[PDB]
JSON list of C-alpha atoms and ligand atoms in Angstrom, two decimals:
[
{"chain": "A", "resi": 100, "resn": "UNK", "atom": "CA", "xyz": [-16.97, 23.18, -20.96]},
{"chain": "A", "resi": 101, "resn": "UNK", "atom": "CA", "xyz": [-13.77, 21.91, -19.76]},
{"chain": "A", "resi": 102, "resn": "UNK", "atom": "CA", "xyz": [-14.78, 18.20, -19.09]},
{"chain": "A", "resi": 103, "resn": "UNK", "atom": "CA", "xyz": [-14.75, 14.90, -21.10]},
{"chain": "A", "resi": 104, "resn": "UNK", "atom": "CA", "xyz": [-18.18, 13.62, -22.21]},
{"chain": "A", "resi": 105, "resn": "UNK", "atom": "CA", "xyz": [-18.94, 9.70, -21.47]},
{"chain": "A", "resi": 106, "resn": "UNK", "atom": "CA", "xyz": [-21.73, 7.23, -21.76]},
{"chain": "A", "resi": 107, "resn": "UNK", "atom": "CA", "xyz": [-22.33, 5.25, -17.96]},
{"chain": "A", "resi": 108, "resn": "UNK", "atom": "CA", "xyz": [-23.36, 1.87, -18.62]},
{"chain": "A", "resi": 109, "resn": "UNK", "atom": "CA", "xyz": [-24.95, 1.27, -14.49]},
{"chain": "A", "resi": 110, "resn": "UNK", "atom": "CA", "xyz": [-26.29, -2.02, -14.23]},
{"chain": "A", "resi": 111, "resn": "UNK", "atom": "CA", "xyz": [-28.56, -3.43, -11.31]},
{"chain": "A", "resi": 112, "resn": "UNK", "atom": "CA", "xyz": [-27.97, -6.77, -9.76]},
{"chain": "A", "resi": 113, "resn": "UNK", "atom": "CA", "xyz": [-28.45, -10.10, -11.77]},
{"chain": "A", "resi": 114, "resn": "UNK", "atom": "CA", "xyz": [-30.59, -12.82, -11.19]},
{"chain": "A", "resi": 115, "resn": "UNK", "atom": "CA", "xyz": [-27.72, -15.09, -12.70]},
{"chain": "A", "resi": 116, "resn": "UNK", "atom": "CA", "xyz": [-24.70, -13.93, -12.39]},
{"chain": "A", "resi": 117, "resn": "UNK", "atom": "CA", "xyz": [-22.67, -16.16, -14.68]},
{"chain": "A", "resi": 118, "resn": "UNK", "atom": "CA", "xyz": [-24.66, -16.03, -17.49]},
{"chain": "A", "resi": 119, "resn": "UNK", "atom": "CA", "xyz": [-24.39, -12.16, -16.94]},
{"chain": "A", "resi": 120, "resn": "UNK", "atom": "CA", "xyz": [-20.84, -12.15, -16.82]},
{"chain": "A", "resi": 121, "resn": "UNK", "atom": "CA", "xyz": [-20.17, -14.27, -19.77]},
{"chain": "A", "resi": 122, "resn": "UNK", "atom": "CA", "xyz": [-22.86, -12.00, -21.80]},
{"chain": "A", "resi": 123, "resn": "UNK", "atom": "CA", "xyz": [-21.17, -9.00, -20.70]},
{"chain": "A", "resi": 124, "resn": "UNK", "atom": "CA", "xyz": [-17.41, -9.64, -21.07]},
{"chain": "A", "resi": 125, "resn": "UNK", "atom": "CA", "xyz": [-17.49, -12.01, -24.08]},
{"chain": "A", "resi": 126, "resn": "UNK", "atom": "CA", "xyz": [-20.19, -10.66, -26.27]},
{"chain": "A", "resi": 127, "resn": "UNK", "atom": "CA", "xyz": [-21.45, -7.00, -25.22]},
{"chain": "A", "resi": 128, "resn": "UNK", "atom": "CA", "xyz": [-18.46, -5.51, -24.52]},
{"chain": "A", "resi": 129, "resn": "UNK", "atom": "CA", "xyz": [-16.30, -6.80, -27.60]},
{"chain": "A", "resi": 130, "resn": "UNK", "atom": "CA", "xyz": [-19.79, -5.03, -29.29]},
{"chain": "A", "resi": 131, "resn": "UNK", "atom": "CA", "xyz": [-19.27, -1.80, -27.75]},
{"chain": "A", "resi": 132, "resn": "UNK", "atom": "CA", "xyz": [-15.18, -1.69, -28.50]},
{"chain": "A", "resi": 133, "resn": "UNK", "atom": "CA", "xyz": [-16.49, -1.83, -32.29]},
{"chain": "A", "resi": 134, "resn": "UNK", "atom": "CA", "xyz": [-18.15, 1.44, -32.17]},
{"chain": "A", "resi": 135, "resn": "UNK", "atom": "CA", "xyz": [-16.92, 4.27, -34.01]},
{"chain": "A", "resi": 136, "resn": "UNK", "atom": "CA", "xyz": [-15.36, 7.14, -32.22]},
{"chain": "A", "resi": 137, "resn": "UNK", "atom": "CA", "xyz": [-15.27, 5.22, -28.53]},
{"chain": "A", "resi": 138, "resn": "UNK", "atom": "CA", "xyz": [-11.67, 6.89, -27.41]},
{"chain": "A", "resi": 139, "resn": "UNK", "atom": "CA", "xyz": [-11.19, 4.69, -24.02]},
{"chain": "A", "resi": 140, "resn": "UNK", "atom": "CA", "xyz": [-13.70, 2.22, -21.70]},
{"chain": "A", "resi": 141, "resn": "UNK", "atom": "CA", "xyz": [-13.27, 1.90, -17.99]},
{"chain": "A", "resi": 142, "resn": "UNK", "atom": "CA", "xyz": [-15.32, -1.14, -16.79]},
{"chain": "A", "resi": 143, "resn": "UNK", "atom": "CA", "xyz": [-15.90, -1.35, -13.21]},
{"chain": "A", "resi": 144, "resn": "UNK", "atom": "CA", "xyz": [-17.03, -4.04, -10.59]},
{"chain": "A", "resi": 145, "resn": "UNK", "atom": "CA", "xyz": [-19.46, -2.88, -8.05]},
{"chain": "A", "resi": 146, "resn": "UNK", "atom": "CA", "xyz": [-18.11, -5.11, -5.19]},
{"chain": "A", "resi": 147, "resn": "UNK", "atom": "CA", "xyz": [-20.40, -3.58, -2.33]},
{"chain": "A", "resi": 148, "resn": "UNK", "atom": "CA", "xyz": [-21.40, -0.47, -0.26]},
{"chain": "A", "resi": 149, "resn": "UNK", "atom": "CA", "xyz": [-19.55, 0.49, 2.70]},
{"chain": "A", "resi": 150, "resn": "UNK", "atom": "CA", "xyz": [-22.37, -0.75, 4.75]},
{"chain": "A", "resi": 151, "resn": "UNK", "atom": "CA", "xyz": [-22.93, -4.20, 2.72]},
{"chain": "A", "resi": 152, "resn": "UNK", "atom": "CA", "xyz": [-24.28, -4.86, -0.60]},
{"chain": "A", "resi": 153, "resn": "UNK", "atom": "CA", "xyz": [-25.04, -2.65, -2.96]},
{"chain": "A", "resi": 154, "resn": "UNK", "atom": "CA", "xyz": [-27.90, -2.38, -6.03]},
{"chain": "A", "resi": 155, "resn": "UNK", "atom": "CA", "xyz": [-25.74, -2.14, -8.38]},
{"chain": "A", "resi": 156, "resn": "UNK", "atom": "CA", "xyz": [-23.22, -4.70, -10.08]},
{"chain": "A", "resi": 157, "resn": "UNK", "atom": "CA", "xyz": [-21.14, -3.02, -12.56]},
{"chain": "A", "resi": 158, "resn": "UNK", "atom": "CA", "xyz": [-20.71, 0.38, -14.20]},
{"chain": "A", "resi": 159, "resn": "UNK", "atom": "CA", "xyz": [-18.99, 0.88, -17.58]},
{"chain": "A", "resi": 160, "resn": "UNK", "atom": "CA", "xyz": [-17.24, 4.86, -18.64]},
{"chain": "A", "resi": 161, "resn": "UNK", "atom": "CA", "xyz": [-17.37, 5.33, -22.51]},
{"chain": "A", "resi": 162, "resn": "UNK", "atom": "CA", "xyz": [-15.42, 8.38, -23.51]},
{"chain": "A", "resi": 163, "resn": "UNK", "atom": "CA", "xyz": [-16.08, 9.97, -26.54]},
{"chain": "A", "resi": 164, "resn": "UNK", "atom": "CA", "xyz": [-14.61, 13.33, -28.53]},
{"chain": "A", "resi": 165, "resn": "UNK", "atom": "CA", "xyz": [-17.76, 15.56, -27.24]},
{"chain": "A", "resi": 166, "resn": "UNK", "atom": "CA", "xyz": [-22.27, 15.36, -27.07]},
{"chain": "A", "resi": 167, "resn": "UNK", "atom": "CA", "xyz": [-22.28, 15.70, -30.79]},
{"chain": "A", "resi": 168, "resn": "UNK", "atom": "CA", "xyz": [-19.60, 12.29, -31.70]},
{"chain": "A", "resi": 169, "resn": "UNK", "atom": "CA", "xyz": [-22.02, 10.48, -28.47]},
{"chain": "A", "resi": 170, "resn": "UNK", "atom": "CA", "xyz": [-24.58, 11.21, -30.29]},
{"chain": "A", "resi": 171, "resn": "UNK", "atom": "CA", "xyz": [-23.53, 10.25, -33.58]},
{"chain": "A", "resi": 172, "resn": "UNK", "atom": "CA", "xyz": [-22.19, 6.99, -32.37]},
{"chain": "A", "resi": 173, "resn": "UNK", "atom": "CA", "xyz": [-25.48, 5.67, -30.41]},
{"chain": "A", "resi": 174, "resn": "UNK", "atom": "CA", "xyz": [-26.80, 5.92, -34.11]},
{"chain": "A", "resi": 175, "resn": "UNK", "atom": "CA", "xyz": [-24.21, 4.11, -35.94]},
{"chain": "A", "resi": 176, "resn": "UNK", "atom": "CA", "xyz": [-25.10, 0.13, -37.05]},
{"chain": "A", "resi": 177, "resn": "UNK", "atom": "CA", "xyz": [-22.29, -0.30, -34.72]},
{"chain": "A", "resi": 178, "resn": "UNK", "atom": "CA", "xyz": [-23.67, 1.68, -31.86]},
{"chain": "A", "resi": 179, "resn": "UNK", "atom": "CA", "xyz": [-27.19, 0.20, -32.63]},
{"chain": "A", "resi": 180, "resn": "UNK", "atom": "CA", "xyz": [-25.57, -3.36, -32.25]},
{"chain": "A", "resi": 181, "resn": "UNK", "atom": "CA", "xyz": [-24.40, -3.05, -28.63]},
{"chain": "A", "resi": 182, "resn": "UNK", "atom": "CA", "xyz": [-27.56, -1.26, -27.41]},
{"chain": "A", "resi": 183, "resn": "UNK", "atom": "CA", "xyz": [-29.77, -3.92, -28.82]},
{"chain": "A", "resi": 184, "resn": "UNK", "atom": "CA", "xyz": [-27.75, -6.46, -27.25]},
{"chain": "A", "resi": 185, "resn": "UNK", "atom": "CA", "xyz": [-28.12, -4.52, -23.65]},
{"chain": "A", "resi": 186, "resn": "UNK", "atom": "CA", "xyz": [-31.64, -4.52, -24.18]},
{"chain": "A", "resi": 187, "resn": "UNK", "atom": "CA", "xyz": [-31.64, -8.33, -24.98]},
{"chain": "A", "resi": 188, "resn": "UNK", "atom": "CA", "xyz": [-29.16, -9.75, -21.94]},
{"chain": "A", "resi": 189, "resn": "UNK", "atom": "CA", "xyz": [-29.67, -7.20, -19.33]},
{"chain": "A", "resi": 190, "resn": "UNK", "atom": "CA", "xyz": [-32.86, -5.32, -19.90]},
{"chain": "A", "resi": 191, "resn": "UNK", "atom": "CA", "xyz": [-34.31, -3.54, -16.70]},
{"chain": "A", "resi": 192, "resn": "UNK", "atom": "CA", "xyz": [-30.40, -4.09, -15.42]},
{"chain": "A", "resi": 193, "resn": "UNK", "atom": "CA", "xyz": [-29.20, -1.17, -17.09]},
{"chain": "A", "resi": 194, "resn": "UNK", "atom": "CA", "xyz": [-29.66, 2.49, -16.37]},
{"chain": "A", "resi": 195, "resn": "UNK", "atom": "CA", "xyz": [-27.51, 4.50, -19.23]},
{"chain": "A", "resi": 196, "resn": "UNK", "atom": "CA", "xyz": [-26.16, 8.37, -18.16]},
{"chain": "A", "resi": 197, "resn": "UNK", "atom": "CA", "xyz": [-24.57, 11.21, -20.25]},
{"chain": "A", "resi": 198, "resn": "UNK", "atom": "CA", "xyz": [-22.03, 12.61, -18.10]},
{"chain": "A", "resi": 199, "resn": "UNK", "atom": "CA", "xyz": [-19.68, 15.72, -18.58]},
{"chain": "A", "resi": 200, "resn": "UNK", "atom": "CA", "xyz": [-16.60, 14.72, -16.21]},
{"chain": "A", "resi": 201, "resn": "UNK", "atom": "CA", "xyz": [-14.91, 17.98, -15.03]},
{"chain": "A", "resi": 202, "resn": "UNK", "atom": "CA", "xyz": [-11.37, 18.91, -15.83]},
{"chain": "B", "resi": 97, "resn": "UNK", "atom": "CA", "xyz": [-6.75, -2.30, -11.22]},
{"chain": "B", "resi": 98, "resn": "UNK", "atom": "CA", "xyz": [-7.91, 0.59, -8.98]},
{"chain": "B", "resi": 99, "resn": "UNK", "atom": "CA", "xyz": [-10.16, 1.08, -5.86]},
{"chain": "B", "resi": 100, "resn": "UNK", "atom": "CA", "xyz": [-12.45, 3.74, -6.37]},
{"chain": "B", "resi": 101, "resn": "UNK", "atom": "CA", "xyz": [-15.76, 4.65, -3.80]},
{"chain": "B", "resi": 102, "resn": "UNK", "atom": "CA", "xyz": [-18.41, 6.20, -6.29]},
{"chain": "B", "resi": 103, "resn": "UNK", "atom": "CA", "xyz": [-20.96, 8.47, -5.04]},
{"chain": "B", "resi": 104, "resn": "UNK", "atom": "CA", "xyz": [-23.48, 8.90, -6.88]},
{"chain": "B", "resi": 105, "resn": "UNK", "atom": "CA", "xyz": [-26.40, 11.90, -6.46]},
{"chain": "B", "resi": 106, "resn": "UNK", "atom": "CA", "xyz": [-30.09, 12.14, -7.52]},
{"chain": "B", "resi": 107, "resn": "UNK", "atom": "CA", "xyz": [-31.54, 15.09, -8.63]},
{"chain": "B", "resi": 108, "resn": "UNK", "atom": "CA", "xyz": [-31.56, 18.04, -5.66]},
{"chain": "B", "resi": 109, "resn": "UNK", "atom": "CA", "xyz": [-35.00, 19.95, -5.54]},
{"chain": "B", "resi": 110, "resn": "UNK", "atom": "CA", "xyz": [-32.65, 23.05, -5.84]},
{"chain": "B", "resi": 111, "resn": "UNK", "atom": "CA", "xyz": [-29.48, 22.93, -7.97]},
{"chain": "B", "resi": 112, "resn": "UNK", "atom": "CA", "xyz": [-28.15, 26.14, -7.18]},
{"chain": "B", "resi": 113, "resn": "UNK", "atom": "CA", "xyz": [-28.34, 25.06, -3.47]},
{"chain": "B", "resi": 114, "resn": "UNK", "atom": "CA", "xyz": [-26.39, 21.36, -4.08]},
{"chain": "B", "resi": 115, "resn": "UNK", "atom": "CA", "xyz": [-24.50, 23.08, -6.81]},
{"chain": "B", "resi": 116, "resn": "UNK", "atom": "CA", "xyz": [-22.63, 25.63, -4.47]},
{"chain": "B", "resi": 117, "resn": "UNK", "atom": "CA", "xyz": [-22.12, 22.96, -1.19]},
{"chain": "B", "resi": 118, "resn": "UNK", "atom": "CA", "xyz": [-21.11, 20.47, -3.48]},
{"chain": "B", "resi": 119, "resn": "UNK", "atom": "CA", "xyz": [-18.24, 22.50, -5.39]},
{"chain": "B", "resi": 120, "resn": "UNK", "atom": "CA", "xyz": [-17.69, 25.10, -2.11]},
{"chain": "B", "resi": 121, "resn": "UNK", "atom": "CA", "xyz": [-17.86, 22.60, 0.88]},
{"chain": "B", "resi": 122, "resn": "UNK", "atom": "CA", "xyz": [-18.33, 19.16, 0.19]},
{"chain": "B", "resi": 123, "resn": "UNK", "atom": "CA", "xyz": [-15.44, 18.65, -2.68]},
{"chain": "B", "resi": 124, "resn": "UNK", "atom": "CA", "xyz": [-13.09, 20.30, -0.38]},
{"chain": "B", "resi": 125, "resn": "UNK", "atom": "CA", "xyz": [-13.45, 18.45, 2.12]},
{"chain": "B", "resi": 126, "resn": "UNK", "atom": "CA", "xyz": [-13.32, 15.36, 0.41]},
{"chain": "B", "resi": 127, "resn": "UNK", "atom": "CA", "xyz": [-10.14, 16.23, -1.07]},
{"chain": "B", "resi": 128, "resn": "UNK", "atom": "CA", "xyz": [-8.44, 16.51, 2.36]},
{"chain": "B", "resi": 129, "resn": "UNK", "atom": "CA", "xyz": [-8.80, 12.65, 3.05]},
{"chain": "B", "resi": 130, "resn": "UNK", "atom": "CA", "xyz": [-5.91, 11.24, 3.36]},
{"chain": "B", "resi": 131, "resn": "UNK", "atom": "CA", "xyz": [-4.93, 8.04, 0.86]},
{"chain": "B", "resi": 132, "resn": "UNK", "atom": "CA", "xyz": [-6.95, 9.78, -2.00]},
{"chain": "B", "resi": 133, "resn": "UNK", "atom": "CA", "xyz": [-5.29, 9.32, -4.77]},
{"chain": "B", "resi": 134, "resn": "UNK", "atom": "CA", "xyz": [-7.49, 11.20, -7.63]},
{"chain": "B", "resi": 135, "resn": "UNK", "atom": "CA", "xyz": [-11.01, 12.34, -7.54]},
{"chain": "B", "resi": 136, "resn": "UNK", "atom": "CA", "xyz": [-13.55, 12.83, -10.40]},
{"chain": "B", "resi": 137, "resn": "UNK", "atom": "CA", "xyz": [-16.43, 14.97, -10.45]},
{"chain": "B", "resi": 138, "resn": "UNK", "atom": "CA", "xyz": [-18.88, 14.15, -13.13]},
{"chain": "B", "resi": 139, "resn": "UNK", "atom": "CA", "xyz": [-22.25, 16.41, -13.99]},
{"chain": "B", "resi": 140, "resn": "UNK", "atom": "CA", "xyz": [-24.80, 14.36, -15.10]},
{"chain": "B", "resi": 141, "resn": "UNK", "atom": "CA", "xyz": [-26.19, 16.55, -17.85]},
{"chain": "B", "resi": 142, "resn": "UNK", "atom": "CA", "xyz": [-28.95, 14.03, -19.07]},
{"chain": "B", "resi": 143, "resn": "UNK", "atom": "CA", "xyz": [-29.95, 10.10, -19.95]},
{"chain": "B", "resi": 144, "resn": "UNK", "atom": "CA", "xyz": [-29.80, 9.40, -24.35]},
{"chain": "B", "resi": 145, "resn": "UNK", "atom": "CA", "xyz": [-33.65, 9.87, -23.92]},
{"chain": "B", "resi": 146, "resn": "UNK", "atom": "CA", "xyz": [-33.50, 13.08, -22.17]},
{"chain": "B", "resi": 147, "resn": "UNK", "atom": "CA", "xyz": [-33.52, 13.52, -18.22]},
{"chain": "B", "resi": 148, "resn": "UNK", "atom": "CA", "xyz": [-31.80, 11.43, -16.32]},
{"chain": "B", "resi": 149, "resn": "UNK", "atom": "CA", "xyz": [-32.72, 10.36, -12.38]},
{"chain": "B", "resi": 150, "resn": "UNK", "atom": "CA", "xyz": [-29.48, 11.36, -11.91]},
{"chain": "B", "resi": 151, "resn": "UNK", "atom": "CA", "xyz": [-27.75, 14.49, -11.28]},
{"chain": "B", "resi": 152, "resn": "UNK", "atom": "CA", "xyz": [-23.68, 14.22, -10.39]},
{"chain": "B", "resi": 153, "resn": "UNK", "atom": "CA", "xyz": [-21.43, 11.40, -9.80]},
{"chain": "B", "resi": 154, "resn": "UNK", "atom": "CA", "xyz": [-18.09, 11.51, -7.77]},
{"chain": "B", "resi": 155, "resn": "UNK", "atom": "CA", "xyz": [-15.16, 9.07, -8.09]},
{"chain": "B", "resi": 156, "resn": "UNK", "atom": "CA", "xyz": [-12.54, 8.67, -5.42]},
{"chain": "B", "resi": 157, "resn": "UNK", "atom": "CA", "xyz": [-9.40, 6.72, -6.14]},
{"chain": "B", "resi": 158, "resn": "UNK", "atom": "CA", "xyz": [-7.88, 4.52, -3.45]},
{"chain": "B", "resi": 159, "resn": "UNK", "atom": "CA", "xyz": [-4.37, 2.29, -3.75]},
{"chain": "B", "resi": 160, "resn": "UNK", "atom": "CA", "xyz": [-6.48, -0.62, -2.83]},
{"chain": "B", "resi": 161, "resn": "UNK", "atom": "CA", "xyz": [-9.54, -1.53, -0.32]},
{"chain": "B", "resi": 162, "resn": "UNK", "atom": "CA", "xyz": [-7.31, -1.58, 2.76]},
{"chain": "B", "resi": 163, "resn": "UNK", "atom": "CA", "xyz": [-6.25, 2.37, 2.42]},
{"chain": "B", "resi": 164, "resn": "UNK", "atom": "CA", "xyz": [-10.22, 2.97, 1.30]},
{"chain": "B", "resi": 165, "resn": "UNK", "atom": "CA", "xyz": [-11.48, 1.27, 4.26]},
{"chain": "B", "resi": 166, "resn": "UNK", "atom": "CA", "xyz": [-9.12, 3.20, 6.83]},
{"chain": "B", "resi": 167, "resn": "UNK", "atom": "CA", "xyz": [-9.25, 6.31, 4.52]},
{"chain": "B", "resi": 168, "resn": "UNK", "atom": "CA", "xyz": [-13.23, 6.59, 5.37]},
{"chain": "B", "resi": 169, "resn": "UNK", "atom": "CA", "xyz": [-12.56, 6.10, 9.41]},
{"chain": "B", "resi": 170, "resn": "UNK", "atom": "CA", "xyz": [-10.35, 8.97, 9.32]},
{"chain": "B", "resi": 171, "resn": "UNK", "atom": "CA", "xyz": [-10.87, 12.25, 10.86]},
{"chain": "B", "resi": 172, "resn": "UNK", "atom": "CA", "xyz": [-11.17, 13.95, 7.69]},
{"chain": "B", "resi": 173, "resn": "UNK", "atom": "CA", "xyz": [-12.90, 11.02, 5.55]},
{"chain": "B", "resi": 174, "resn": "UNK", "atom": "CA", "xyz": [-15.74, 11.48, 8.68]},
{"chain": "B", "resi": 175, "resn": "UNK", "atom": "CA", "xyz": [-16.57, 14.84, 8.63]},
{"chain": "B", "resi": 176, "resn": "UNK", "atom": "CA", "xyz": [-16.98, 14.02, 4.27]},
{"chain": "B", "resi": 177, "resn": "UNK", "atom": "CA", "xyz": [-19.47, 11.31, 5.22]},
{"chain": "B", "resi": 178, "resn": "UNK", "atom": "CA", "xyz": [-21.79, 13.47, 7.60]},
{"chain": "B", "resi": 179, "resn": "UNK", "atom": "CA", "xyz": [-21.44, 16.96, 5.43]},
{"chain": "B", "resi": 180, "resn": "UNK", "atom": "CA", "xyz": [-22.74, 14.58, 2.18]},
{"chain": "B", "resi": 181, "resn": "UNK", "atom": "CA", "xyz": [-25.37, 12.92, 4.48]},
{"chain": "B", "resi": 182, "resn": "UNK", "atom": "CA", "xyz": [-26.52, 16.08, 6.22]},
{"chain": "B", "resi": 183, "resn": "UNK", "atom": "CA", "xyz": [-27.32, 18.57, 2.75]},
{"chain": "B", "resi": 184, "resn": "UNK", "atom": "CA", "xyz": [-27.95, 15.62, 0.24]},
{"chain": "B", "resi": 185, "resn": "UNK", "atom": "CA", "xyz": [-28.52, 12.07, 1.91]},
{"chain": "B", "resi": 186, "resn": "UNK", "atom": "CA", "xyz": [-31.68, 11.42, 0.65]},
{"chain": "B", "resi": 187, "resn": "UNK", "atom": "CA", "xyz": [-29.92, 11.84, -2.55]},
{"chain": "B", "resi": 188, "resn": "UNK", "atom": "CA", "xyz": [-26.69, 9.69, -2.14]},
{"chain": "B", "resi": 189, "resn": "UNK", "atom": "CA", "xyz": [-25.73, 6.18, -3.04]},
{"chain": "B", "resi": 190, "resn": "UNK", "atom": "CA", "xyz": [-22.43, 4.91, -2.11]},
{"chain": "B", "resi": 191, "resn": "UNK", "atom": "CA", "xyz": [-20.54, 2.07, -4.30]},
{"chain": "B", "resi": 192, "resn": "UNK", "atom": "CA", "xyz": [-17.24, 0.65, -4.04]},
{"chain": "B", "resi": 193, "resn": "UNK", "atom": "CA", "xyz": [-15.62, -0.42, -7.31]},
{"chain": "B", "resi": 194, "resn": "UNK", "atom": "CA", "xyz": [-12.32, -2.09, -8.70]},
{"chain": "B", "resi": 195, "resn": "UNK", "atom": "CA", "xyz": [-12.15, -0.41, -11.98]},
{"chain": "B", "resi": 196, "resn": "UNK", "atom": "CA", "xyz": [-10.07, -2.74, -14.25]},
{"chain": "C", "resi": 216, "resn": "CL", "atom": "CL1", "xyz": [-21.75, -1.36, -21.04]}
]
């Protein structure tokens, strides 16, 4: 209750960066704008730690309506699209999350 | 584009115990740093699968990296870093972002 559900995208570093990058802003995320009921996308750059480096590269926040519209969306051809192509460019990269962010 | 230092929590052998420092003591005293400029708390109630290695995220909003940098050396950004250390750093990852 009183919270906004959303999808986190965390992904892990790549071994090629570019070829990442290009995947990820030109083809998987133009995927994951198409799906049905996605109400707003933050994408963000991991750029280190305060220490150093970090794991992890980038993080994307997919907000949708509430559990049961998530749910409904990972399902659609849409949804099915995007997390196929995750699976095929990224892989091991990506960690996905269902978080409830608090009002 | 915004700064933001994401902190991001495994899952605590006792939630009741990281539940009430985390909400009573910890998010109150992160709110007291100085240059914050919005902070989001985020349960993470499960992966699409079903559990998830993870267990709450926190967002922290900064102007830009200058203000987080000298926003973490302060007084008040200090005693945040050692309370989140000293009842959940085995738990606790630490990432700076530029959310675009
Ligand atoms: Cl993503």
């Amino acid at each position: 209750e009183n919270m906004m559900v959303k999808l986190i995208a965390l992904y892990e570093q790549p071994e090629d960066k570019q070829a990442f990058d290009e995947h990820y802003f030109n083809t998987h995320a133009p995927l994951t704008r198409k799906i049905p009921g996605l109400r707003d996308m933050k994408v963000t750059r991991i750029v280190g730690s305060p220490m150093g480096e970090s794991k992890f590269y980038l993080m994307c926040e997919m907000y949708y309506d509430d559990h049961e519209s998530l749910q409904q969306a990972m399902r659609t051809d849409e949804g099915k699209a995007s997390g196929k192509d995750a699976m095929k460019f990224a892989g091991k990269l990506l960690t996905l999350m269902i978080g409830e962010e608090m009002d």
